[PDB]
């Protein structure tokens, strides 16, 4: 029933600048002694969330003193004076004052660092699928920065268009890279019509684009 | 030590039901109550209940009375959470919590809901070669093809090796069926000498598989 609303819902912050996720409520205040029962939550990829600040501002065991909390009644914040790359995740704002138990939507902190380009690697088909009739061309872009890329494939000089499948990892925490991988996905008869088989990549930390190739 | 281990992901029919564990550990189980909370893609974290696991006296969401029941097994320091009548919007990931400084939380259970069939993975070889080698650098991983549900753990020489993996995050497919990639970053002088394998783990379909990845 208490809502609480999230105001960025989505905030990139490039490392060593200051980032901010505010909360919006329906006056969090026990009459007991006056204690507001505001908690911030940080679930890192991989991870099930875990408790940063308790009671509005009141750091949990463990937690770095950049992170700060404030706020009163009905508006709350949670700044991080300077955001570190172990920051990347999804921050959730949730109050205990009055059951039930509610929490915002959530807040995704990205973080911006300095422009890598990826490193591209092509993977034929398996033999073991090629025996159960399906031919799969896989695409590796490895440890880039931005999130930003694009995988053109390429069969015997033909554009490819919506037979391929991207998928990027989560923000690294270690490093703040991505890693992308492009399937592009055929039948053992499609497959075998054709010869030259090409994944094309364009990035920003690319003056060209990088082209990676094979034959049958 | 001070741990929460939930039981394993669920594919559930509609009208079914559901019922999720969570063993404790590293402290007394009846000392401190339970709090399960569930996120349903792309919604809030939503409080479904709270269990007193010392006396075994509860308290539930509107939403979540007469559909959940919280009970026990305080010789197995399991507390459990049982959801019938499941529904579409019951898809989501399910969290135990331990009461006292919000931690810890349990590594959470997807619980999918759906009328669709159980499919186990096909796992395939993404083999190193010439074309996927950079700088004495070979990149290499599995294929995880074909399956129903979500999740899919996956891991490399039985998570002895985690420097240079990137599991990809799922893909569906045309015919509503997941794909994933796992890839690792190795020396190329590794190849021949060490043993890469990929340990394929889906529990909903209940398949176990460790693939070995070999240069051709």
């Known amino acids: 029933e208490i809502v609480l609303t999230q105001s960025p819902l989505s905030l990139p912050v490039t490392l060593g600048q200051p980032a901010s996720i505010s909360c919006r409520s329906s006056?969090?205040?026990?009459?007991?002694?006056?204690?507001?029962?505001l908690n911030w939550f940080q679930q890192r990829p991989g991870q099930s969330p875990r408790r940063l600040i308790y009671?509005?501002?009141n750091r949990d065991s463990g937690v770095p003193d950049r992170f700060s909390g404030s706020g009163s009644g009905t508006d709350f914040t949670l700044r991080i004076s300077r955001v570190e790359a172990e920051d990347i995740g999804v921050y959730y704002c949730?109050?205990?004052?009055?059951?039930?138990?509610?929490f915002g939507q959530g807040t995704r902190l990205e973080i911006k660092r300095t422009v890598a380009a990826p490193s591209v690697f092509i993977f034929p088909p398996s033999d073991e699928q090629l025996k159960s009739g399906t031919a799969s061309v896989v695409c590796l872009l490895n440890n880039f920065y931005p999130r930003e890329a694009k995988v053109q494939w390429k069969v015997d000089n033909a554009l490819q268009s919506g037979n391929s499948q991207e998928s990027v990892t989560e923000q690294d925490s270690k490093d703040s890279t991505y890693s992308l991988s492009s399937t592009l996905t055929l039948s053992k008869a499609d497959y075998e019509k054709h010869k030259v088989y090409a994944c094309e990549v364009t990035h920003q930390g690319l003056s060209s684009p990088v082209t990676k190739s094979f034959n049958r | 030590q001070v741990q929460l281990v939930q039981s394993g992901a669920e594919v559930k029919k509609p009208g079914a039901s559901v019922k999720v564990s969570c063993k404790a550990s590293?402290?007394?189980?009846?000392?401190?109550?339970i709090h399960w909370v569930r996120q349903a893609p792309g919604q809030r974290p939503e409080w479904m209940g709270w269990?007193?696991?010392?006396?075994?006296?509860?308290k539930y969401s509107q939403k979540f009375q007469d559909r959940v029941n919280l009970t026990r097994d305080t010789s197995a320091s399991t507390v459990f959470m049982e959801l019938i009548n499941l529904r579409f919007e019951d898809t989501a990931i399910y969290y135990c919590?331990?009461?006292?400084?919000?931690?810890?939380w349990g590594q959470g259970t997807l619980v999918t809901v759906s009328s669709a069939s159980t499919k186990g993975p096909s796992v395939f070889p993404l083999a190193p070669s010439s074309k996927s080698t950079s700088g004495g650098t070979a990149a290499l991983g599995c294929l995880v093809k074909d399956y129903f549900p979500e999740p899919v753990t996956v891991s490399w020489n039985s998570g002895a090796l985690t420097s240079g993996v990137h599991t990809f995050p799922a893909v569906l497919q045309s015919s509503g069926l997941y794909s994933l990639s796992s890839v690792v970053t190795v020396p190329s002088s590794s190849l021949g000498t060490q043993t890469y394998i990929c340990n394929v783990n889906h529990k909903p379909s209940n398949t176990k598989v460790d693939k070995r990845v070999e240069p051709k």
């Open positions: 009671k509005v501002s």
């Open positions: 919590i331990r009461e006292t400084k919000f931690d810890p």
């Open positions: 006056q969090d205040l026990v009459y007991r002694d006056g204690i507001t029962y």
């Open positions: 949730m109050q205990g004052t009055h059951w039930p138990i509610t």
């Open positions: 269990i007193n696991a010392g006396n075994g006296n509860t």
């Open positions: 590293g402290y007394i189980f009846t000392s401190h109550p």
